[PDB]
């Protein structure tokens, strides 16, 4: 592959969602058993039924809750260099 020589993984012509990235479009996964290598696809294809007089309107909805996790602070370390360096 462009990323290097991959040994032990079976190369297949089947694209899948990326599991373990290798690089340059190549990912690997454990699949029914052995490790395989493949070119990752980006997502399922979807053709929108576009026309000049057609609209899709939701007749129902759901409420979703998602979780976003953000760091706010570090551990407040302090080093006494004189002791650290000399003791």
């Amino acid at each position: 592959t462009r990323a290097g020589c991959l040994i032990g993984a079976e190369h297949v012509n089947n694209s899948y969602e990326c599991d373990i990235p290798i690089g340059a479009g190549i990912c690997a996964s454990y699949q029914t058993q052995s490790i395989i290598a493949y070119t990752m696809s980006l997502g399922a294809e979807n053709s929108v039924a576009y026309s000049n007089n057609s609209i899709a309107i939701p007749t129902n909805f759901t409420i979703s809750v998602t979780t976003e996790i953000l760091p706010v602070s570090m551990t407040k370390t302090s080093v006494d260099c004189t002791m650290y360096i000399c003791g």
Binding site: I55, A56, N60, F61, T66, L70
Partner: peptide, 20 residues
């Protein structure tokens, strides 16, 4: 060491084709 946000969103679920 951080904050977690629970985001409540409205998501369209069951669309239908209409002529417009």
């Amino acid at each position: 060491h951080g904050v977690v946000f629970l985001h409540v969103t409205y998501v369209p679920a069951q669309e239908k084709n209409f002529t417009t």
